[PDB]
């Protein structure tokens, strides 16, 4: 069982017999959400030395993240009011960016590799695009489903397999991230499990047994890239989707 690293264990506990209060209780998932919140709080509270203008070396990091997500959501929705949807496009980044660096620490735990939470967050953003689009643009919201000047005898086919791609968008956006984080962690644990039993046979294998160690180091080098790039790709697709929902093509 190489997948035991994702087990959810209850720690602080709470129960009753009147009402099902077992929904909220401090758990491994919940404790790592508390840790994510305290890290994100720590990146801005004690980072700023006594509210100085000059912005010490720690604040350049949270300066660059801010600027690379402003200049990304200005180039996507880019209309009359792009900044009204900027806090959500930033707080969808920082959760995924911090929750995929915390998960790299060896005896730790991936928030992002729970499909039930990430798929739920994706369905929340998809319904919050459809409701916002219907509210802002009435019955002509469905004009999104015809591409451009197209010949009329093939328009209903191009409507059906446009709407099918419109509600595949509900689960695709989440399952991309879930699949990347889950496959990366499962790859690292399985190769560690193979190189461990590689190094317990006869003593000639601990000699020149440095090359599988170097391969695992190279995969860990790759895994930060595949963890930060997904945190960026989430925040670019849910900027493009707000471009479609707010502005009709």
């Amino acid at each position: 069982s190489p997948l035991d690293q994702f087990e959810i264990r209850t720690l602080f506990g709470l129960q009753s017999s009147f009402i099902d209060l077992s929904c909220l209780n401090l758990t491994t998932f919940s404790l790592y959400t508390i840790i994510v919140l305290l890290v994100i709080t720590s990146l801005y509270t004690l980072t700023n030395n006594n509210n100085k203008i000059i912005g010490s070396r720690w604040l350049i990091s949270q300066e660059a993240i801010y600027d690379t997500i402003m200049n990304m959501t200005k180039g996507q929705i880019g209309g009359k009011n792009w900044g009204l949807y900027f806090p959500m496009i930033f707080t969808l980044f920082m959760f995924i960016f911090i929750a995929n660096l915390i998960s790299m620490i060896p005896y730790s735990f991936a928030l992002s590799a729970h499909l039930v939470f990430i798929i739920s967050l994706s369905i929340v953003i998809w319904l919050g695009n459809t409701i916002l689009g219907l509210y802002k643009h009435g019955w002509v919201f469905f004009s999104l489903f015809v591409p451009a000047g197209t010949p009329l005898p093939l328009v209903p086919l191009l409507v059906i397999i446009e709407t099918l791609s419109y509600f595949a968008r509900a689960i695709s956006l989440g399952l991309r991230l879930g699949s990347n984080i889950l496959a990366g962690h499962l790859l690292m644990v399985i190769l560690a499990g193979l190189t461990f039993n590689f190094m317990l046979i006869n003593l000639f294998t601990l000699v020149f047994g440095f090359v599988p160690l170097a391969m695992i180091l190279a995969i860990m080098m790759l895994e930060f890239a595949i963890g930060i790039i997904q945190g960026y790709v989430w925040a670019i697709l849910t900027a493009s989707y707000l471009k479609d929902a707010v502005y009709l093509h």
């Binding site: 997948l3 035991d4 994702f6 087990e7 959810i8 077992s22 929904c23 909220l24 209780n25 758990t27 998932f29 919940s30 959400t33 994510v36 919140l37 994100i40 709080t41 801005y44 700023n48 203008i53 912005g55 949270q62 300066e63 801010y66 900027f86 806090p87 959500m88 930033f90 707080t91 920082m94 959760f95 590799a113 729970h114 499909l115 039930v116 939470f117 739920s120 967050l121 929340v124």
Partner: protein, 48 residues
Amino acid sequence: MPQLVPFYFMNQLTYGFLLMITLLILFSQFFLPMILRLYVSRLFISKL
């Protein structure tokens, strides 16, 4: 897969959405404008 289908669905989703609303209110009202105060201050000293 056995590990991502327990009874803890409402646990996961409850603390997750509490953290999302928390970070949303928290970022938007606190931490983004404390960077933007730095921006407007730097530009105000620059324009003088």
